[PDB]
Amino acid sequence: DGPEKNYEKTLAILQIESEKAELRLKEQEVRRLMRARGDGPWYQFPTPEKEFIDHSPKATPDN
Amino acid sequence: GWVRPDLGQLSKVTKVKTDRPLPENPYHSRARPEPNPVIEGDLKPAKHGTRFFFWTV
């Protein structure tokens, strides 16, 4: 075919793998921040359920 | 003219009124912290698939 094919295919492969590197490191820092502080969707550890509390009138006022 | 209540008349709710207001925020509850926001987006394919080690797709 020629040299242009190899050259430009190499360029494509290079941008692909560079972007992958970028995203892997980004994922590392993202997981770090999400775990150190639960601001994000991940590492949101469970809490007690709210809907199983009874809010009705009790037997004593100062419940 | 005081008539004795019958069997189950003192065992039910009775709908009082008063000049008082409602208590605003009983339990002296503090403000609730705001939940973490939801990521708004129509999700797309993963960028270059799995960034695993060397798998292409």
Short summary:
The structure is cut from a larger assembly and holds chains A (63 residues) and B (57 residues). With 63 residues, chain A is mainly alpha-helical.
Overview of the structural elements:
Chain A is mainly alpha-helical and 63 residues long. Chain A is built from 1 helix and no strands. Chain A is rod-shaped. Chain B is elongated, with a radius of gyration of 31 Å. Chain A binds chain B through residues 16, 19-20, 23-24, 27, 38-41, 44, and chain B through 36, 39, 47-48, 51. Chain A: Complex I is composed of 45 different subunits. Chain A: It comes from Mus musculus.
Give me the secondary-structure topology.
This is part of a larger assembly, with chains A (63 residues) and B (57 residues).
Chain A: H1 3-36
Chain B: no helix or strand
Distance between the termini of chain A: 84 Å
Largest sheet of chain B: none
Q: Count of DSSP E strands of chain A?
A: 0
Pattern of helices and strands of chain A: H
- The rounded Rg of chain A comes to 27 Å
SSE-based structural type of chain B: little secondary structure
PDB class: oxidoreductase
Keywords: ubiquinone, complex I
Entry title: Cryo-EM structure of respiratory complex I from Mus musculus inhibited by piericidin A at 3.0 A
Chain A: NADH dehydrogenase [ubiquinone] 1 beta subcomplex subunit 5, mitochondrial
